[PDB]
Amino acid sequence: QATLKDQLIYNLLKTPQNKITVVGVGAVGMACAISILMKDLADELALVDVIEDKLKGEMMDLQHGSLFLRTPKIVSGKDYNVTANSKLVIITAGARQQEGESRLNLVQRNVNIFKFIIPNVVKYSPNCKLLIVSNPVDILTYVAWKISGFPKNRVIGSGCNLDSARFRYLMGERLGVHPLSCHGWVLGEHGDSSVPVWSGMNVAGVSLKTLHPDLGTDKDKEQWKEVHKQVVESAYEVIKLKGYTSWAIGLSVADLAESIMKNLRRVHPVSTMIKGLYGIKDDVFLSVPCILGQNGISDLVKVTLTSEEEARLKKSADTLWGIQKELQF
Amino acid sequence: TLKDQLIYNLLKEEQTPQNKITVVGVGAVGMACAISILMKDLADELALVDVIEDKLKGEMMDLQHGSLFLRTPKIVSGKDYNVTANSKLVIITAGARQQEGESRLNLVQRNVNIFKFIIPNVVKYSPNCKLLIVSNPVDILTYVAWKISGFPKNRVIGSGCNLDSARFRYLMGERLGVHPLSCHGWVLGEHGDSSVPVWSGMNVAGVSLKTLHPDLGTDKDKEQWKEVHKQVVESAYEVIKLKGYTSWAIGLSVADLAESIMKNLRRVHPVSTMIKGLYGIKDDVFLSVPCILGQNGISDLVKVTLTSEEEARLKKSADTLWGIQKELQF
Amino acid sequence: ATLKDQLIYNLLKTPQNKITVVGVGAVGMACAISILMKDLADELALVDVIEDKLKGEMMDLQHGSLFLRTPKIVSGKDYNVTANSKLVIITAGARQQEGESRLNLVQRNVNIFKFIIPNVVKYSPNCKLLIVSNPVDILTYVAWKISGFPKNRVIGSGCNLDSARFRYLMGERLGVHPLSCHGWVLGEHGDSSVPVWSGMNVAGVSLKTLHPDLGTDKDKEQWKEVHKQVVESAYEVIKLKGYTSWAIGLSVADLAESIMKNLRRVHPVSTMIKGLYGIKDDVFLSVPCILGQNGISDLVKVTLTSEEEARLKKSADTLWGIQKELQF
Amino acid sequence: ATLKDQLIYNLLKEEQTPQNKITVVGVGAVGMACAISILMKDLADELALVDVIEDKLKGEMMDLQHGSLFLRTPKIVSGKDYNVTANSKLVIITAGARQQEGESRLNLVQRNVNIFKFIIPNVVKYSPNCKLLIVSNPVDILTYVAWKISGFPKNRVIGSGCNLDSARFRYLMGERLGVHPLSCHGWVLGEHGDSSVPVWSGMNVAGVSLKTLHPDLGTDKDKEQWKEVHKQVVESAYEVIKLKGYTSWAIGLSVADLAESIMKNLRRVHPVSTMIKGLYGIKDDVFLSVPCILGQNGISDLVKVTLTSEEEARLKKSADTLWGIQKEL
Numbered sequence A: 001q002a003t004l005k006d007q008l009i010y011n012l013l014k015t016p017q018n019k020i021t022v023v024g025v026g027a028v029g030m031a032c033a034i035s036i037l038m039k040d041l042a043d044e045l046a047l048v049d050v051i052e053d054k055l056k057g058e059m060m061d062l063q064h065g066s067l068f069l070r071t072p073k074i075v076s077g078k079d080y081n082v083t084a085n086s087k088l089v090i091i092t093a094g095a096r097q098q099e100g101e102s103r104l105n106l107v108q109r110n111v112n113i114f115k116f117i118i119p120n121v122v123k124y125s126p127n128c129k130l131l132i133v134s135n136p137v138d139i140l141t142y143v144a145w146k147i148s149g150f151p152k153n154r155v156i157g158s159g160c161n162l163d164s165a166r167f168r169y170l171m172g173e174r175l176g177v178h179p180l181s182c183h184g185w186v187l188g189e190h191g192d193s194s195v196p197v198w199s200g201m202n203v204a205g206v207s208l209k210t211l212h213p214d215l216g217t218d219k220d221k222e223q224w225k226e227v228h229k230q231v232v233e234s235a236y237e238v239i240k241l242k243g244y245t246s247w248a249i250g251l252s253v254a255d256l257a258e259s260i261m262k263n264l265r266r267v268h269p270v271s272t273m274i275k276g277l278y279g280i281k282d283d284v285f286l287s288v289p290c291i292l293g294q295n296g297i298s299d300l301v302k303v304t305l306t307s308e309e310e311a312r313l314k315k316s317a318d319t320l321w322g323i324q325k326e327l328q329f
Numbered sequence B: 001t002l003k004d005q006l007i008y009n010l011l012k013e014e015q016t017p018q019n020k021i022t023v024v025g026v027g028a029v030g031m032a033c034a035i036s037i038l039m040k041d042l043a044d045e046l047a048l049v050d051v052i053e054d055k056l057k058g059e060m061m062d063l064q065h066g067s068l069f070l071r072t073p074k075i076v077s078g079k080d081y082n083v084t085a086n087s088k089l090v091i092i093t094a095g096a097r098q099q100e101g102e103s104r105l106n107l108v109q110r111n112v113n114i115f116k117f118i119i120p121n122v123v124k125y126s127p128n129c130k131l132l133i134v135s136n137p138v139d140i141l142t143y144v145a146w147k148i149s150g151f152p153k154n155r156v157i158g159s160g161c162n163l164d165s166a167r168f169r170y171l172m173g174e175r176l177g178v179h180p181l182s183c184h185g186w187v188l189g190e191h192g193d194s195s196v197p198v199w200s201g202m203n204v205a206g207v208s209l210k211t212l213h214p215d216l217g218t219d220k221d222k223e224q225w226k227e228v229h230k231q232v233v234e235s236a237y238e239v240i241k242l243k244g245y246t247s248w249a250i251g252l253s254v255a256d257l258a259e260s261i262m263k264n265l266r267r268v269h270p271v272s273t274m275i276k277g278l279y280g281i282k283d284d285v286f287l288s289v290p291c292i293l294g295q296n297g298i299s300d301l302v303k304v305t306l307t308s309e310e311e312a313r314l315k316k317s318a319d320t321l322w323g324i325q326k327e328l329q330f
Numbered sequence C: 001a002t003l004k005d006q007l008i009y010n011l012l013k014t015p016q017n018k019i020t021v022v023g024v025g026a027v028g029m030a031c032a033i034s035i036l037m038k039d040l041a042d043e044l045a046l047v048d049v050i051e052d053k054l055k056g057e058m059m060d061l062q063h064g065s066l067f068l069r070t071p072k073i074v075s076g077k078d079y080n081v082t083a084n085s086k087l088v089i090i091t092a093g094a095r096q097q098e099g100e101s102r103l104n105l106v107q108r109n110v111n112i113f114k115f116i117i118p119n120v121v122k123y124s125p126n127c128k129l130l131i132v133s134n135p136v137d138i139l140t141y142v143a144w145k146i147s148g149f150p151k152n153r154v155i156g157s158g159c160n161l162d163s164a165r166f167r168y169l170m171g172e173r174l175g176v177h178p179l180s181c182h183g184w185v186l187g188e189h190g191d192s193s194v195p196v197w198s199g200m201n202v203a204g205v206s207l208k209t210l211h212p213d214l215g216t217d218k219d220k221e222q223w224k225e226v227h228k229q230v231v232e233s234a235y236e237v238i239k240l241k242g243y244t245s246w247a248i249g250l251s252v253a254d255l256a257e258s259i260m261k262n263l264r265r266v267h268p269v270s271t272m273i274k275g276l277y278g279i280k281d282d283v284f285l286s287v288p289c290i291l292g293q294n295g296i297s298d299l300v301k302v303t304l305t306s307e308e309e310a311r312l313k314k315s316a317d318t319l320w321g322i323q324k325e326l327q328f
Numbered sequence D: 001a002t003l004k005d006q007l008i009y010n011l012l013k014e015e016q017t018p019q020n021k022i023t024v025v026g027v028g029a030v031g032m033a034c035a036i037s038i039l040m041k042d043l044a045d046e047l048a049l050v051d052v053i054e055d056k057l058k059g060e061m062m063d064l065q066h067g068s069l070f071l072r073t074p075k076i077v078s079g080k081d082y083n084v085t086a087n088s089k090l091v092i093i094t095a096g097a098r099q100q101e102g103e104s105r106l107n108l109v110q111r112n113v114n115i116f117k118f119i120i121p122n123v124v125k126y127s128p129n130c131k132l133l134i135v136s137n138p139v140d141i142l143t144y145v146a147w148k149i150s151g152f153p154k155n156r157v158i159g160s161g162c163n164l165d166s167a168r169f170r171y172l173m174g175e176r177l178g179v180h181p182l183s184c185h186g187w188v189l190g191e192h193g194d195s196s197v198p199v200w201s202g203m204n205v206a207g208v209s210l211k212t213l214h215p216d217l218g219t220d221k222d223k224e225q226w227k228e229v230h231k232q233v234v235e236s237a238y239e240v241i242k243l244k245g246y247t248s249w250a251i252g253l254s255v256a257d258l259a260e261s262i263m264k265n266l267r268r269v270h271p272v273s274t275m276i277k278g279l280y281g282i283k284d285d286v287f288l289s290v291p292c293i294l295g296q297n298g299i300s301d302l303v304k305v306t307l308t309s310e311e312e313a314r315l316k317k318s319a320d321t322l323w324g325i326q327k328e329l
C-alpha cells in the first residue's frame, strides 16, 4: 500500500540563497513584491505585517500566480522568524503619505514603529542589507542605521531613485527621447526640498545647461524649473487622483534590489550619510549617487554641484537635520 | 529652443502603433493586468480606459513615472475610446466585482449592462483586435462580447479557467513537492462554482495520477483530492474575505494569455469559447476548454477525453451557464 | 589625485551565484551565452587549456557587458577562477565527428575527466556538477565516482535535449507549441534512447489512448519516425554545419535555471537508477528528476509499458557494458 | 481518423502574415550571434535566415529549431531564396567577407559592395517597408551603399556603427573606475574602425564630466594614460580575432540592442552609421556614427554632440578617410 506521492516519487534529499523579505503589505509593499517577483530576483519571498488577514490574502494571491513566476517559495507571517536568512529586507511599513500631507509629518509615528521592526529584522537576518522605503525615507534610513547597529553600507534608503526616474521621464517627454537616454539627477531629500542637478543634465553627454544657460532659472522662457516642480508635486498629485502611489516606487525599489542582489555596482541616488561632503557637518542622511552591490553602498560619487545647487542641497540637509536632531530613540 | 539645438530631426512621421494593448478598467484587476503586461514587454503602447477619470489619470501617471524601468515607451489613458485606436488586443476588466460570499453569477445584470456600452466603442476603434474578457462572470460576458461585437469567435476569448487551472497546479505542486510548471492538470467549464477538475488528465512527467491512485477524485479517496478542487472553487472567496478582492493571480493569468496571443505561440490554454458540437452540446454555450492561442486568437480546440463523471459535470456546468445566456437580449 | 579618487569616495575595502563553464568549444560557449542572457549568475568563469581561444572568448563576452546583467566574467587555464562556484558545467572533451557515435568518445573524454573532476571539486566542494560532455551518461558516472560527491550533486544533461527535440517534432506534427506538447525521451542520450509513448499527451489527453498502436511497427502514421529523427538529429546537424551548439546550450541553461533558482522542476537528466525497474548495477541514464538548489532531490518513477521497459533495459545494458569496464 | 484529428478541432485554416518578423542575412559567426541574441530577447515572432551555403544554413536553422521549447519565437525558417524573408520589419545584413587576423575592415569594401549589389535589391523586393540594419564591414561605407542601392529614405538604413565600440569603451571605463558600464557614459563616434573618435569631453559618471575633473584626460600628457582605453577599443577586434579567429558575441549583443530599440519603438540614443552632412564641417555624403534616436521608423533624429576643436578635427579626419573610399565606388 502506497500513497499517490509515494508511488510517483522516489525521494533522495529530505537554506534559501537569494531570499528577500518585504515588511509591510500596503500598496507600496505589494508593488515592491510583484515587481521583484516578475524580475526573478529572489528564490524565496517573505512578507511580514501586523494585519493578519490582509497578509494571508496577499500571500495567497501571489501564491496562486506561482505557475507564472520563477520564485518557488512565498511565505508570510506576523512573526519575524519567517524572514530568517534574508539577503535583503525591504521595509515599507508604517503610516503612508496622504493627500496634501508632507512626508515629514510621518516621522515620529514611523520612528516608533521602527523601534520594534528593526531589532526583529536584525535578529533573524544579521547579515542582510536593509532597504528603507517607508517615509520620510531619509530620516528613517538614519533611524534604521542607528537602531540596527549595522555598518552604514548595509542601510540604504530608496531615496531619490524614484525622483530621478520621474525627472528623466519628464525630461524625455520634453525632448522626445526615452528616459533611458535622458540623464539627470535629483538629490537630497526625497520630498519637497529635493535638488535638481541642472548642471549634470545631459543627452549623449551634451550638457543641456551649457546649451541653455537659463536652464533651471525663473528667467527661463522654456520654464524647465516646472519639470522639477512636477517631480516634487508628483506624489501629491498621484495620491490626490488614485489615493496613493505604488507602481513607480515598486519599480524603483526593484531596480535597487536588482543592483544589490546581482552585485551590479550601478550608480543610484539613495539615502546615505553625507557627513563631510558639501560642508555638511551633521549625521544627515539624504540621496547622493552611490555604487550599489551585494555589500550595499560600497562607494559615494562626489557630484560636482554649482554654487546654487550646493546651497539647495545644504538647505535640504538643514531641513532634515532640524527634524533628525529632535528625535528620541 | 533647447530641443532644436540638441536634436536634428530627420522625419516627424508618427506611425500607427504596432503592438498596442488596451486595458479597459483600472480597478485592481485591470491594474494588475497592466503591470504584468508591462513587466513582460508585451506591448509597445499601453492604453488605459475607464469612466472614473481621476483614478484613471492617477494610475496612468504612476505607471508613466516607472517608464525608466520598463520597455514600453507609450502609456496613455482617457475616457474617450479614441485613445484605444488600433489595438491588437483589448483586455476588458471593467465592471462590478464579487463582494464577500457573492457569486460571480450575481454580477450578470450589472456587467452585461456595462458591456453593452463598452464593446461597441472598443470595436469602433480597433475593428481588427482580439477581445480578451476578464470581467465576471467571464464565460457569459465572453458570449455577450461575441454577440455585440460581431467578431468571429476566434477573436473573442474569455480568460476563463486559465487561473483556476493555475491554482489547481499550484495546489497539486504543494501536495507533491513539485513546481506547478511540472504539475499538469486541467480545470474546465465555468470560471466559478461549477468548474470541472479533469482528474483523468492530471499528471507529472506523463504519469497519470489517476492511474497510480484510482480513487483520485472520488469520495472514497483516502487522500481527499476532491478537496484540492474545492479549494480551487473557494480560492477567490477566501482571498476576498482576507484582503477584499483578488488581483495578482488573475493579472498574471491574463498576461500569460496575452503573451501567447501577442507572440503567436500556439500554446494551449483553458479559455472561454463556444463549445457547441463538443460532448453532444447543441447550444451556443461559452465555457473553458483547452484552446490553441495565437496572434489570431483561438485557432483550434482540443477535444479532451473525459470520463463519464467528468463529462456529466461539464454538461452540468454548460447547463448552468446556458440557463443564463439564453435569457439575454441584444 | 587620480580621476577615480576625485570622483569616488570609497566606503568598503565571495561570489554568491557563481557558475563555471569548463570548455570553451562551441558547446561551452553556447551554454555561456545562454546563461548570460538568462541572468542566472552574478559571476561567470570560463576554464579551458587552450590559452588563446579562452582569452578571446572571455574578451568577446566582456565587450558585451553593457548589454548583460552579469557583472563579473573571468577566465583562466587554472582553477583559481573556479573557486566557490555553485554550479560547474563540464563541456570539455572530444566531440563526435560526422557519423561517429557518442560512445566512441569514451576513452578520450574519460581521460580528460580524470584530470578535470578531482581539481574542480577541490575549489568548489559544495557545487553541483552538470556534465554535458559526451557520452554524457557514462561521464556522469565517471564524475560521480571521481568526485566523491553524493549523487544528488552530479547531474548529466542527459535527455533534456532529446525530449526538447521530441516535443518540437511532436508540435510540428500537431500544430502546437512544444511547451504544450508533452513527451519524454529517457535512457541513453544517444542511439538507445527510449521514447515513452505511453506518457505522450496534449492537455492531459493520452496520445496512446487515442491511438493504441502509437509508436509500434503496426502504426499506420509511423510515429516511430519521430523518435528516429530525435536519435538522428545530432548526426544530421553535424553533417550539415559540422557540430551542434544552440539547442544543447539552451537545454543546459534550462537545467541551470532550475538549479540556480531552486525551482524543483522535472527534467530527464542522467542519474543513478539502481533500484528502479529491478536494475541492480550503478548504471547512469536519464529518468525524470526533480531539480533544485541541491541538485537532484527526487526521481520520478515513470510507468513504462512492457516494451518501453524492455527498451530502457536495453539502453541500460549498453551503458553498463561500457561503465563496468572502466577502472579508477 | 488520424491522431491529430482525434485530438484537435481546427477553427482557423491559415496563419496571418507575421507581425514582428526579423531576417538575418548571413549565417556566419556574426549572423548566428545576432540570431541567438534576438531569439533570447523575444524580439521577433518569426526569424528568417538567408545565406548561399545551403548545408550550413539548414544545419543552423535545425539547431535553433531544436531549442524551440526554450524560446518564445514560434517560427524559424531559412532558405537561399529571399522569398523566405518576405514582410520583415527588420532585415539585418551580416553577410560577406569578414575581418581576418591583421586585416583592416576597409580591405573588405569592394568585395562586400559587390555582394550588396545582389543582396540589397533582393531584400527590398520582399520587404519594401523594412528597416535595414547593416552589420557587414566596413559598416559605415556599406550603410551608404545599401542606402543608395535600396532607394530607401535614410532613416530606414542603419549601420550598427560604433554601438559596439562605445560598449567596449564603457566596459573599459567601468573596469578602471569600478562601476558597471551601465553607469559609465562615454561615446566613440566616427568610423567603426581605426579612425574612431573618443568624445572625452562627454564622458561622465552620474553627470560628472570626467574631463572637467581631470583636464589632461585623453591627451598625451595624461599621467593615467586614458588614451590607452580608446587604443584598446580600436584594437579590440584585431585582438579577439587573433585569439579565437573572429568576433561574434559582443557584436551579436550590440545588434540585438539596436533591434530592441527599433522593434519596440524605444527612441533610445545609439551611435549608429548615418549621413552626417551638415555637422562638424562635413559637406560630403559620408556615413559614420553619431548618436541617433532609434525607433520603429529607424533613425528619426540625430543628437548634435558638442565637440572640442580637437575631437571635431578627429571626426572630420575619420569622415575624410571614409569619403576617400566612398567616392571611388
Ligand SMILES: Cn1ccnc1C(=O)c1ccc(NC(=O)C[C@H](C(=O)O)c2ccc(C(F)(F)F)cc2)cc1
Pocket (backbone or CB within 6 Å): B200, B201, B202, B203, B206, B207, B208, B209, B211, C198, C199, C200, C201, C202, C203, C204, C205, C206, C208, C209, C212, C303
Ligand atoms: C492493445 N490495446 C488496445 C487498446 N489499448 C491497448 C493498449 O495496449 C494501451 C496501453 C496503454 C495506453 N495508454 C496509456 O497507458 C496512457 C496512460 C495511462 O492510462 O496510464 C496515460 C499517460 C498520461 C496521461 C496524461 F494525463 F498525462 F495525459 C494519461 C494517461 C493505451 C493503450
